[PDB]
Subunit: 260 residues, 4 copies
């Protein structure tokens, strides 16, 4: 459904980001992968996109925690793609600790990437989409953008802001043919959560995978993880014309996390 | 995208219901419509379905406001298709008036259909899906299942109820291959809506299309109606394996209505 | 605080409702209580209520599930008070049980009491509060009016309904000097809940005071029961002048229940 | 009554913060105000707080936008009041502008003061309350912490961030005797707002009162601004025992803003 569209995905050299660039390409969209890692992989990964889906893939490095760098990013990203229809702010970092102790430097880091990066990101993007008369800004928030969890102050503060920011963007460009929504995922066994499948498994020491099928049991009623492909799928739906009038809202995939 | 699957939509003889079945059929699925009207209009709609999408289309009458009648409906609808994977409880009605002047028979009439029917249609269908190991319950609430408007008590109550019933249904069958979600549409220009557009037309004694754009410019920030066709597309998505972990939540297609 | 103010509280011969009336009286209001029980016990509460707080207290039996009786109730209750400034629709019932197995009668009754009863009582009251230019309609919903939970479909539904209905009331009478909010309590150790604690203690075969701690843990993080006197104090406050602008919202007292 | 207890209110030299401190004092609590302004107007309000409520009112200058400054502030404040029982993080600023034109400097300033400040404030304040076993943290978010309005990206994002932070604060200190809640008020006629009123006045060609009516008209059903005094009443209620079990939730006084 997305043939001929130009999309950009932040933090997409791995995890949920990569799975998304994956599905958008499959939908027939040219994509601008972004993130960190061994140049080799990133290339094998970008290279592999044009192979599976027959679209054009481009890689641009950018530490999206820096406002200007981020803004200069999308601009170059757009230059490479020769346009900019779909922007998906996905890059993000997680840190655990009770407030009174949360490192001050970590707090600023999460806010700067998990939230601020979304704003500047959008800022630069909008003029282009506005000019065109069509656009899909897809912010990747999380359950923790609607509800809260212990010792994740910074992460929850950030995501809650992302969701809120999403609304503003939606209303501000209402009817313009442009939409902004925020996918709010649950438990996705990636490195960001694998660090918590082993942390919760050292305070009990019990099986490393028992601390997982347990990790879920406490938050996700489905007792099953949410696969990145599925998220990429949701990003594809948001980009369809079926969603022309779905703006400023949140789309949750959390095995029933928010239902209770 | 749904080849083989069997679907059912209450109140699908016209309006949003009909559009729902149409996209489910278009996606390759046998559907069972239902509703009121001139058998002539119903038969053409039922047949146009088998003709345009090359699938089996069954018609079943039932005054879903009747308990055993609706529960019976479900089973008889399961024999018609020879199984039952998707259920779209979309039947519903309306009445405008201030709380202290809302006929008690209207209050009832609404709660019976708009809320109770979803309950009876579910309980009847659940045992079936539970045995198949797969299932989809799509309840068509509204924006009035999240926020409220004047002189629509009954309707706002039942929707707020369908949303909460949706939540419960999702939790009781988590990880069983069955998901339950609520589509909370915004203004869709149907007859149920055309009735209020005309009431505004006369109240302010203004144009009929001038009274339309007004109804929008009050709740729908996009100033654009939500096409039934899109809602049928959002229903198709809730059926895709992409939404296997999307359960017990609402899917707002409202042009910004709940963003503010 | 409320010296002189004339209040009414459905289902107050016991538990939460009795508390709601107790703080109301304690705050200087004349109160009308109602509900089932032994005419002896009922007289005692009404009795104590009078001489302990120095205000008039009346009783009025009426089965609130009877739409017609309940309306005659407020008018009747209004006559004894010679006014009606505050209305608290508190009465309600529970019934644990899956969906495919929820007795249609158990659903009908909870819907008739927990939801419909609120509507009628409000319709029968608004008129009075409207003419005087001051009113307080305090609805007792529940966290389950905000989020769902297994085997409690009828309850969770009706509760969402109340929150939704509450909003409509507030909007229809906004500015008139009448406010409408919904108190949403967490676990309150009352007969209604003890009954569930006695089931968990039965199912798991553990100590009763233990099952109580286990009940709390699951949904209520504070691990401390919400107290009646508390919900009472909250109801009082909603009647203060600070609340004057607080209308059509939910006041949640659940020890974190809905925060996660 | 809060006699004995000690309280702190950021940004209280005027506006909502000032009315907040006046109510806690009237309740009998010794308070510490903070903010900017003319040392005479500051020292004036400070005096009235003692000469009118018979309590101790200390003053402390500090640019809450600075992480360390706010962390020492609560430090000195505690040492000043000889303790810290109630923290009211109120300090905040606004700036209207559409995402694409919203000043980067203007953004980071709003985030540092409308979100981060709440963080550090809470970070230094907790240790004290934790050791005491009792505490109250009152965050002054806004209706824009639940919903969104155009051209307020920074502000909306920050508020949600707060409503978000509020939850983690509560959860983390759940059952400890310390609660965290957020007051999300609607339009409160203050400078911050008179500025938005004078923008609609000179940008539409009409009275400064013609615009006010509109300001409310659009978002506030009650068509009446919320009074800074009422907010204080809320804050007082939150510090009461009636609210011992009310934690991690928002307390909205918007006049129906969020009900629709
Ligand atoms: N893992 C989960 O359960 C889960 C749940 C909900 C939401 N999310 C979100 O999904 C998105 C990706 O998280 P993840 O799980 O994939 O973690 P990840 O570790 O798997 O991915 C982080 C991605 O961001 C890149 N990144 C590194 N530095 C960056 C920078 N300065 N700017 C931008 N990107 C940078 C990484 O190299 C990587 O590609 C995030 O914003 C996170 O909110 C994850
Ligand atoms: N129009 C909107 O803006 C809008 C917005 C939100 C939700 N909805 C919902 O969409 C669904 C359809 O509403 P609509 O706009 O299509 O109105 P409609 O008038 O267009 O459709 C009502 C459908 O129900 C059928 N119906 C008649 N009697 C019935 C009965 N006894 N039992 C079951 N169905 C019966 C009708 O024949 C028709 O097919 C509803 O539940 C309504 O909540 C509509
Ligand atoms: N216990 C909790 O944790 C909890 C939590 C949230 C909400 N609530 C609500 O508090 C309200 C009171 O519940 P409860 O815990 O006090 O149960 P309860 O058993 O303690 O009280 C029920 C009250 O309703 C009366 N009642 C009996 N038949 C009635 C009828 N036909 N019509 C009206 N009232 C009738 C009862 O005699 C009693 O006074 C309810 O609507 C329930 O939703 C309770
Ligand atoms: N006015 C409204 O309608 C309204 C509505 C919702 C929320 N609020 C909130 O009320 C709180 C106060 O807003 P306001 O309306 O009173 O604006 P205000 O202009 O009236 O008050 C701003 C307060 O912050 C102080 N301030 C100055 N520099 C500061 C600094 N560096 N750090 C901290 N504080 C500083 C000011 O001196 C003043 O006391 C805010 O966080 C704002 O969210 C106001
Ligand atoms: Ca929740
Ligand atoms: Ca709203
Ligand atoms: Cl947690
Ligand atoms: Cl309205
Ligand atoms: Cl707006």
């Amino acid at each position: 459904m997305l043939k001929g569209k130009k999309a950009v995905v932040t933090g997409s050299t791995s995890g949920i980001g990569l799975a998304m660039a994956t599905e958008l390409a499959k939908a027939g969209a040219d994509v601008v992968i972004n993130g960190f890692g061994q140049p080799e992989d990133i290339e094998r990964e970008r290279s592999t996109l044009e192979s599976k889906f027959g679209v054009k893939a481009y890689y641009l490095n950018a530490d999206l925690s820096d406002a200007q760098a981020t803004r200069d990013f999308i601009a170059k990203a757009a230059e490479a793609l020769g346009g900019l229809d779909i922007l998906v702010n996905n890059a993000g970092i997680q840190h655990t600790a009770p407030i009174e102790e949360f490192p001050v430097d970590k707090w600023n880091a999460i806010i700067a990437l998990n939230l601020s990066a979304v704003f500047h990101g959008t800022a630069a993007a909008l003029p282009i989409m506005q000019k065109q008369g069509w656009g899909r800004i897809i912010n990747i928030a999380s359950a923790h953008g609607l509800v809260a969890s212990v010792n994740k102050s910074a992460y929850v503060a950030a995501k809650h802001g992302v969701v809120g920011l999403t609304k503003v963007t939606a209303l501000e460009n209402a009817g313009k043919g442009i939409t902004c929504n925020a996918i709010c995922p649950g438990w996705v066994r990636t490195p960001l959560v694998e660090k918590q499948i082993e942390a919760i498994s050292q305070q009990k020491g019990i099986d490393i995978e028992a601390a997982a099928r347990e990790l879920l049991a406490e938050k996700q009623p489905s007792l099953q993880f949410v696969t990145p492909e599925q998220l990429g799928g949701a990003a594809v739906f948001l980009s369809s014309a079926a969603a022309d009038q779905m703006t400023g809202t949140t789309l949750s995939l959390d095995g029933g996390w928010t239902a209770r």
